[PDB]
Amino acid sequence: HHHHHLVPRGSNPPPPETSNPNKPKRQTNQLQYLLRVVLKTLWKHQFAWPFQQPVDAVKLNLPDYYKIIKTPMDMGTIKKRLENNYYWNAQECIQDFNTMFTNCYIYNKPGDDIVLMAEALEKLFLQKINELP
Numbered sequence: 001h002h003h004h005h006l007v008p009r010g011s012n013p014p015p016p017e018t019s020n021p022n023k024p025k026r027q028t029n030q031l032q033y034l035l036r037v038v039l040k041t042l043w044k045h046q047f048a049w050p051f052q053q054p055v056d057a058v059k060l061n062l063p064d065y066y067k068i069i070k071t072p073m074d075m076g077t078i079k080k081r082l083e084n085n086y087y088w089n090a091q092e093c094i095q096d097f098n099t100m101f102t103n104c105y106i107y108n109k110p111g112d113d114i115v116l117m118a119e120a121l122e123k124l125f126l127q128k129i130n131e132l133p
């Protein structure tokens with residue numbers, strides 16, 4: 001038989017939402033700080049780049065990524081959420097950062113470059129979180 005299963009192909013999942021008109025939203029001092037200080041400082045760090053967009057499993061040849069990671073999250077998504085006032089409180093935003101870090105620790109191994117990057121960003125995150133109003 002001449003069906004060799006070269007199609008259908010994979011794809012990335014759709015990315016997490018950044019707008020939801022029926023979701024309750026507020027602007028708090030803590031969320032403004034999360035955008036103005038926490039996010040915007042992590043974003044400029046030399047280790048931010050793998051975390052600035054959803055994991056593109058196709059491009060990066062990570063065909064198992066979305067077999068393993070069911071709640072993807074990245075700082076591009078977090079940044080678009082903050083810009084769109086998507087959140088109700090700081091806790092929602094913080095859980096997204098925690099998700100992103102945890103995903104990286106699940107998928108990869110202790111000592112991997114990506115994990116060293118994640119660990120460093122998390123360190124800085126935790127320090128900036130201690131300065132929250």
Ligand SMILES: COc1cc2onc(C)c2cc1NS(=O)(=O)c1cc(Br)ccc1OC
Binds near residue numbers: 050062104117
């Ligand atoms: C194994 O490659 C990756 C694992 C990852 O877990 N989370 C993300 C995001 C992520 C990205 C890659 N691929 S990559 O090309 O961005 C990459 C980054 C580093 Br720092 C080290 C290796 C690497 O791919 C081989």
